[PDB]
Design a binder for this molecule. Structure first.
Ligand SMILES: COC[C@H]1CC[C@@H]2/C1=C\[C@]1(C)C(=C([C@H](C)CNC(C)=O)C[C@@H]1O)[C@@H](O)[C@H](O)[C@@H]2C
Ligand SMILES: COC[C@H]1CC[C@@H]2/C1=C\[C@]1(C)C(=C([C@H](C)CNC(C)=O)C[C@@H]1O)[C@@H](O)[C@H](O)[C@@H]2C
Ligand SMILES: [Mg+2]
Ligand SMILES: [Mg+2]
Ligand SMILES: [Mg+2]
Ligand SMILES: [Mg+2]
Ligand SMILES: [Mg+2]
Ligand SMILES: [Mg+2]
Lengths: 5, 236, 236, 5
């Protein structure tokens, strides 16, 4: 999965 | 609710203790109670709220993904029909996840967003609103799937418009908003080109604003910038 | 209870799904429901029950330890009195932990232990009984602290007596029982010499029985043997 | 902490 914050 | 009898300061104190103890459900319940006292949240308190619910729904999402993958394999050609249990338990986790998202969206709508006038709170809350509609979208299938996606897009877009007018390009909230909206485009809206364009523009404009920052402001910022780069590397 | 309408096989199936998803509270609730169907548990089902509750109470214990350490520092000389919140929240976690231990001890008493006649189930359940009284002891202070400690000791001792009569020295349940009873001696009963003696005797007697095992039985066994050695290295 | 299983 791509990174989120 | 069940936090109505506890002092606001005590709820904040206990939210910080729960964080230290990695008790994120408790954290979230304390922060919900604090929001329900009706006063605006400070900058640090906003971070407690977002961390709490991010970790709760993050665990639910990770579990949902495990179960959905089992469910999909269970529905392949040549798979033994193992009964309704995998679907049922996936649905159980899904309904609980939806419940938490609805709770967060309800706090933002009653009445965090309407009372947030400073850019750093208004963008923060609208980013959360986009995030929790995005999590709803990750599990959505019925008639309102497109409306859930558009609700996420609309919140992110309002946050984006404010952030570009009112914040520097290196502002961590602006950067994190762009990071997540870019992921929304790639993973939810079937718009990889928009996702890539947004991540690259955001990164480049932040690079060019680093020179204005102190050493510490040069930290969460380059931190999120590295996440933008990580995503671009995954995507290209 | 709330699992009363679900098939036993479905509860077992969902316990395995919850484990895969790292949803240990759910796991534990499914396995409690399975136990409450009133049939004995198989070997694999016993492992599901113990894993579920071990992970639930393990997280509660880790949080309790964080909060208790904060509480103790908060009660040092020169510490600002920060109010009742740390004690309150430690008590909240403690009461929840006690609740889970009481639930497990209730399942073992109604009616897992009384119906367990084979050594591998009887020792397994008595070990769990010792373990959950040990966790109660870790947080106990009042008039019944000594009784809680003796309840743990008594369960472990009955398990030890059966295990030595009925199981080989390399049996993983026998080994894990000895590991945990040794920790009970060191950490709960203020008996480090007994803890060390038990761990060393157990290790040596298992070493001398390895030659009888197949390659696979030579696995969880040497696994637990390494934990005995780890503890001895910590202790000497 | 010491190891248990
Ligand atoms: C609603 O969106 C909240 C997002 C926006 C970006 C960032 C956000 C969340 C938190 C509270 C913050 C993070 C920074 C990146 C943490 N740093 C490190 C690890 O070194 C991660 C936390 O989850 C904050 O510290 C950061 O200032 C801001 C608020
Ligand atoms: C009530 O006490 C249960 C204890 C007794 C020792 C051991 C126990 C628990 C479980 C179910 C088992 C473990 C072994 C060591 C796992 N192996 C690995 C990681 O390589 C750890 C699990 O927590 C089992 O597999 C093992 O067979 C037995 C049952
Ligand atoms: Mg008040
Ligand atoms: Mg559903
Ligand atoms: Mg643009
Ligand atoms: Mg039936
Ligand atoms: Mg108490
Ligand atoms: Mg002896």
């Amino acid at each position: 999965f791509p990174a989120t914050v | 609710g069940a936090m109505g009898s506890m002092e606001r300061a005590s709820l904040i104190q206990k939210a910080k203790l729960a964080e230290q103890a990695e008790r994120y459900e408790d954290m979230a319940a304390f922060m919900k109670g604090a929001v329900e006292k009706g006063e605006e949240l400070s900058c640090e308190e906003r971070n407690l709220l977002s961390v709490a619910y991010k970790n709760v729904v993050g665990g639910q999402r990770a579990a949902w993904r495990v179960l959905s993958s089992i469910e999909q394999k269970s529905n392949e050609e040549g798979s033994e029909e193992k009964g309704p249990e995998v679907r049922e338990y996936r649905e159980k986790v899904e309904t609980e996840l939806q419940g938490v998202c609805d709770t967060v969206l309800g706090l933002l709508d009653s009445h965090l967003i309407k009372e947030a006038g400073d850019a750093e709170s208004r963008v923060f809350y609208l980013k959360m609103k986009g995030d929790y509609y995005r999590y709803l979208a990750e599990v959505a299938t019925g008639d309102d799937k497109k409306r859930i996606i558009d609700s996420a897009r609309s919140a992110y877009q309002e946050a984006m418009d404010i952030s570009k007018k009112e914040m520097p390009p290196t502002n961590p909230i602006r950067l994190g908003l762009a990071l997540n909206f870019s992921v929304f485009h790639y993973e939810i809206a079937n718009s990889p080109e928009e996702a890539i364009s947004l991540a690259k523009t955001t990164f480049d404009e932040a690079m060019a604003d680093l020179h204005t920052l102190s050493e510490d402001s040069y930290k969460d910022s380059t931190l999120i910038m590295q996440l933008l780069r990580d995503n671009l590397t995954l995507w290209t």
